[PDB]
Amino acid sequence: SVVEEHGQLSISNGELVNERGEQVQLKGMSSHGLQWYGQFVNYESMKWLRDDWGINVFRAAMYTSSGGYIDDPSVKEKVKEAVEAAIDLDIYVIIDWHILSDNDPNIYKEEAKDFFDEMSELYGDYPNVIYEIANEPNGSDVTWGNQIKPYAEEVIPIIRNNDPNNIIIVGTGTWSQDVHHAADNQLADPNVMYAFHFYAGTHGQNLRDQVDYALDQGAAIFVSEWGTSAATGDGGVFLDEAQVWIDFMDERNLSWANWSLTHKDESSAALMPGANPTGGWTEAELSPSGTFVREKIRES
């Protein structure tokens, strides 16, 4: 139903819109790393998230390093499974080239180009796909103008040769926080968005104002990862600040994916130790974070 109704997504005047030009807001879950917690990514669990939580997007977080794709490329087949499930479920799907410790996207750019060539050749004639080409650039020596923008200007052409206009999300500096610099030096492609990531354990008032600055430059922003925890993914759940961010995102029509769908013993994890990898979770099998995120998407 979602993808049949909204169909082809695009950017118009800095906003995500559907094929009839109406604003649309995606809300869903991210996997944790597919090399660690891939058992939670399958048609049945995605169907349960669609039907019980109300998700309309799912993000497949394919780490590159940390035992991910560069070390063992078999994880690309789990991305394919997730994309195919999203197609069958009629929801959107984010293919996330999940850089982190490999903090400059240029480190594995050759591999990225080949991966995105393959994915856009396979799936480029479906409207469900959203490409996220570099999760979280980070480090003082990785800047928008010097590293990230030129990386995007190598990878985007590869995708566009196969898929002329599905959305591409491009990471920003400082762990996808530095939307100000990206918004002042935007990419040419008209269906690009810039990633912004937050964690509710950080006091967020200036970060909200910086997102507003970026939006005021006509840049489109996708909150492709956020947590209810501290920036480590752990240390406590911060639902008051999370709610402030939820309301901000609704006011600004910002799409989002929450980190993350796993049973790992960390506060950002949505599931308890006993949660079935194929879905059907009871209240007791959701963590405090998961309970909150489910409520937010159901309310929407």
191-218: burial string, b at 16+ Cβ within 10 Å, e else: bbbbbbbbbbbeebeebbebbeebbeee
Active-site residue, 251 included: no
Report the run of H or E that residue 29 belongs to, with start and end: strand 27-31
Q: Is the CA virtual torsion 235, 269, 37, 178 positive or negative?
A: negative
Q: How was this structure determined?
A: X-ray
Q: Does residue 203 sit in helix, strand or coil?
A: coil
* Pairwise CA distance, residues 70 & 72, whole Å: 6
User: What residue has token string 């002042």?
Assistant: 184
The DSSP secondary-structure symbol of 255 reads -
230 labelled ligand-binding: no
* Pairwise CA distance, residues 129 & 83, whole Å: 7
281 labelled ligand-binding: no
* Pairwise CA distance, residues 167 & 170, whole Å: 10
Instruction: Find how far residue 27's CA is from the centre of its chain.
Output: 10
- By residue count, the chain amounts to 300
266 labelled ligand-binding: yes
Catalytic residue among 19, 225, 283, 295: 225
Report the run of H or E that residue 158 belongs to, with start and end: helix 149-162
Instruction: Find how far residue 150's CA is from the centre of its chain.
Output: 21
Nearest CA among 229, 179, 247, 182 for reference residue 207: 179
* Pairwise CA distance, residues 50 & 298, whole Å: 10
* Pairwise CA distance, residues 149 & 157, whole Å: 13
Nearest CA among 16, 167, 2 for reference residue 96: 167
Catalytic residue among 5, 22, 111, 136: 136
What are 93's strand-pairing partners? Answer: 58, 129
Query: Which option is the CATH number for 1-300: 3.20.20.80, 3.30.230.10, 3.30.70.360, 3.40.50.300?
Result: 3.20.20.80
98 labelled ligand-binding: yes
Kindly give the pairing relationship between strand 10-12 and strand 15-17. antiparallel
Distance, first Cα to last Cα, the chain: 16
Long-range contacts of 295-300 (CB under 8 A, 24+ apart): 296/27, 296/246, 297/27, 297/28, 297/53, 297/54, 297/55, 298/53, 298/54, 300/25, 300/27, 300/54, 300/250
Tokens of 175: 């762990």
Q: Does residue 250 sit in helix, strand or coil?
A: helix
Helix 288-299 and helix 239-251, axial crossing angle in degrees, nearest 10 = 20
220, 284 contact by CB (below 8 A): no
* Pairwise CA distance, residues 231 & 229, whole Å: 7
Tokens of 76: 């690309």
Active-site residue, 136 included: yes
Nearest CA among 195, 110, 177 for reference residue 138: 177
84 labelled ligand-binding: no
Q: Does residue 156 sit in helix, strand or coil?
A: helix
Tokens of 297: 């998407």
Q: Angle at the Cα of 116 (from 113 to 119), degrees rounded to 5?
A: 150
259 labelled ligand-binding: yes
User: What residue has token string 């002329």?
Assistant: 164
Residue 143: CB atoms within 10 A of its CB come to 17
